[PDB]
Every structure is written in structure tokens, then in C-alpha cells.
Ligand binder design. Sequence first.
Ligand SMILES: CC(=O)[C@H]1CC[C@H]2[C@@H]3CCC4=CC(=O)CC[C@]4(C)[C@H]3CC[C@]12C
Lengths: 216, 219
Amino acid sequence: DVVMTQIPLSLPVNLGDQASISCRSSQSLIHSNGNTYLHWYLQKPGQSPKLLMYKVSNRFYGVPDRFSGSGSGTDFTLKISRVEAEDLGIYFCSQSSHVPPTFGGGTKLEIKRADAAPTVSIFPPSSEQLTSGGASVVCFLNNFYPKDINVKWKIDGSERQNGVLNSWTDQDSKDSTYSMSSTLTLTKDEYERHNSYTCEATHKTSTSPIVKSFNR
Amino acid sequence: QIQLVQSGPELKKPGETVKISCKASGYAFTNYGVNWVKEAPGKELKWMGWINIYTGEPTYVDDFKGRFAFSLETSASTAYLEINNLKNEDTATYFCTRGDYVNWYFDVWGAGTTVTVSSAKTTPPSVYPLAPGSAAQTNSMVTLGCLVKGYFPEPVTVTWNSGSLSSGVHTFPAVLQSDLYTLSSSVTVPSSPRPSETVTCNVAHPASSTKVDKKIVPR
Ligand SMILES: CC(=O)[C@H]1CC[C@H]2[C@@H]3CCC4=CC(=O)CC[C@]4(C)[C@H]3CC[C@]12C
């Protein structure tokens, strides 16, 4: 199969700016018939790909002046000229020069904003959680930018990874920050045998960690 | 509109047979091929096979070959995928594309059919209330949430004060502790509103016909 590879994964952009996506390939895409079948799809949220550009440089129809493309053989690049409210999504490059036509990973065209470190909240496990056995512990790391953070769950001091199931939100349309939250699960008594539970967040905007906590 | 239109989302326990239709209207079916493309949870938008209508012969990439069966009923314009004895890992969304013979692209795709393969039986959720280990005045906002846990199937709908609290709420995606799902939501309110005025998380899980209202009560 021919590997197609994209860079970046998220492309932070100022709307109204220049924006350039780049795509590259394992084998070459120039064909026996002197042709290049390098095409580009865009997948807007929870929806279906729509062909944007074909054979490196030709657009599809509808598609506007703002889109463009180039390159050869191993390396190709798309470019939007004034990126707009209507262009953000994943962006896939694929090749049809070979079999099997391979798809290429994608880069989302997200929005870039002045940063924010994550507002965090540890919450103890409840009456009923406890009355059923089992006690989930929850840390909401919230309204932050940018996407990469991560959450240690220090448990007395020694850390943990059974249980910790983490989940994340997409870019908050209203303010562009992110949010995320881990749920550590411990049985009602793996729970009732420790003091001190601490999720520890590490994110760019504090050289120090940002560690909420509570004692059992 | 010239479009490929495909069937409903489905839910199958493993070892079963699901059959996906894809109907072409508005275009000369025989003149393009219908290529099936797969979207697995954050894996590759991977290509499956192709069914060329001037012949009715299928090509397969090697992976899905044979267990996956494309078919055709041209005087109906409809294309077919059957997956027999579906594994768990046969959970994705499947798309069909009008593929072209000239410049070799895929220009009309249909909405997708999600197949969920899981053994689970429907369970209503356990909505649990999350109120704060008495942090103070953390500045001027309080944050509480609900942990609606252990449900099958998706979806649930979470809201607070019957829809009256929306700026602030952040429901996070549903993930899978062991066959069932766990979901949670957060509402940040001004510190004079909680506990002065009540905050409730309302969750309804329709595929079980249950609504749970949980009032977030101090600790
Ligand atoms: C008609 C059609 O759907 C098109 C869309 C993509 C195309 C294929 C793309 C890959 C390819 C490369 C070749 O050089 C042989 C032909 C094939 C195998 C093409 C045959 C026709 C296809 C399947």
C-alpha cells in the first residue's frame, strides 16, 4: 500500500490569514501516462468528504479562488489565501496514481488564540456511587489553549494508570479554548483505603504543575 | 440532486450479517464506479473495494476480500456491501463514492452508515451528582457536573435547569469502560447562584426511555 503523510495535525490559523497545508507520499505519483493523481478532500464536522482539488492543481467546481495546490512526485502543498469561517475542517490528501488508492491522515484547520491554562476542579465520589460499590474520581481541566495538556493522578504520592479514562472536547466555537476531563475509577474500597487523591495537570502556561486535590 | 443515498445506522452483535445499500439517482450509474471507503474511530479513511457497473465485477483490496461482499441491482441503481460474522473491529462508518474513469477522483460521497458492533444489551444510565470538595471562592465561579455512567447505547442528551444553563456547559465525549459507555458534563455558574439558586443536570437516554433529574446539592 503507498503511505500518504501529512504535517501539521492541527493548523492554528487566524481567519483572514494565509494558510498552507502540506502533504507527501511514499512512492511517486507521476504515472505511466505522464499524469499525477493527487486529490484533496475537506471533511467539515460530523459530515462527508467533498473533492476540493484534482490532479495537483485543478480545483473542483464551486470551489473558489481561495484554493490552490502544487508539487511533484513525492511532495505537494495546498494553500488557502484568506482562510474563512467556511473552510475549517479536517483536510485529507489522497492519491489515485496507484492501487490501492490511499488516503492521507489530514490536518484540521483550527483557530489560534492567545493562550489559556486550564481551570481545574477535583470532585470526590458520591453517596450513591459509594452505595453501589465503586467510586469514580473526576478532574475537569477546562477552558484552556492549546490542546496538549496531560494529567497525572497522584494517589498518595505514587501515581496511577488503571481506571484513568480521559476524554476531550473539540474547539469551543464560542471562545476557542478547549476542555478535557479524566475519570479515575477505583472500587469503593480501593477507594476507602487511601488519603490524598490528586490529579496533576501539565500544560505549557505554567512551568510548575497545576494540581488540585482533596484528602479522603 | 445527483446523489448517492445510503441507509440507516445499525447495531449488530458479532457473528452477524449487515447489508448496506447505496442508491444512485440523477446520474448514469453505469458510467462511474461505486467505491466503498471506511472510516474507523480515528484510524485511516481506508479504501475497501470498487464495483464497476459496466461489468458487475468487484475489486477488493486484499484486506476485506471475500468476507466483505459487494453486489449490484443496476435496474434499481443500488449498490451493496454485506459484512458477515462481523467482528467488533467492524465498527466504523462506511461511505460509497461515485468514482470516475477519466481523472480518477471521488466526487459524490453519501452520508455514511455507521455500524456499531457490540455485544451489549441496553442499560439505562446511573446519573451521579458531582459537587465540589469544598474549595472556596476559587475566584468567583463554581463548577459542578454529572457523571452519567454505564449506559448502552449512545446517545444520551444532558442539559441543566431544563436547558436554561448553556454558556458554561461542556459535555465531554462518551468513552468505553468495558462494553458500556461513561459520559460527564460540567456547568460553571457564578458563586452567588449555587447554592442560593438550584442547579439540576437533566439526562435522558432515549434507547431505554429514561430521564433522570439530579439536583446538585452541597458538599
Ligand atoms: C471508475 C472509478 O471508480 C475509478 C476511481 C479510482 C480509480 C482506480 C484508481 C487506481 C488505479 C490505478 C491504475 O493505474 C489502474 C486503474 C485504477 C485501479 C483505477 C481504476 C478506476 C477507478 C477505480
